[PDB]
Design a protein around this ligand. Sequence first.
Ligand code: HEM
Length: 144
Amino acid sequence: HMERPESELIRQSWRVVSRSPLEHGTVLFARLFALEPSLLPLFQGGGQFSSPEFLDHIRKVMLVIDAAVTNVEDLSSLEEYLTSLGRKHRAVGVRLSSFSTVGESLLYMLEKSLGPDFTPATRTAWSRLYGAVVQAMSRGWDGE
Ligand code: HEM
């Protein structure tokens, strides 16, 4: 139940991001790995000593976010998918807490993409949308 003005804040900002999703995705992940560098070895080539490739995984992440934005007014049709996606991440050793770090990284990347256009309402909207995505994913840890 996000109302139209906030929905439109999200849709407009997402269009900006969507001009260059890999570029922006790399910003998100660079911040993520600064906060939680332990995540790196999950990716192909991310270890000092099969696994997803980094840029392909960014495309995937941006496609999930894209589906969330498409469904910003009501995420209900994505719930089963998201729960499944959470299960997948759990199974490979990604802690649920790391999704909070992703959220921080997402807000960072948006701030960088948008500057003053990243209004307080836009930030709050995105926090609520992403929070809802993570809520659905969390079913995967039995950890709602
Ligand atoms: C801490 C952050 C993350 C790490 C370390 C990470 C890691 C991974 C790993 C290791 C896989 C492979 C899973 C497998 O093959 O079974 C994967 C798959 C995937 N991840 Fe992530 N992930 C992260 C966040 C995200 C987020 C936030 C999204 C979406 C919003 C996402 C979307 C995907 C998708 C769509 C797949 C493909 C799943 C499939 O094969 O069906 N990831 N991720």
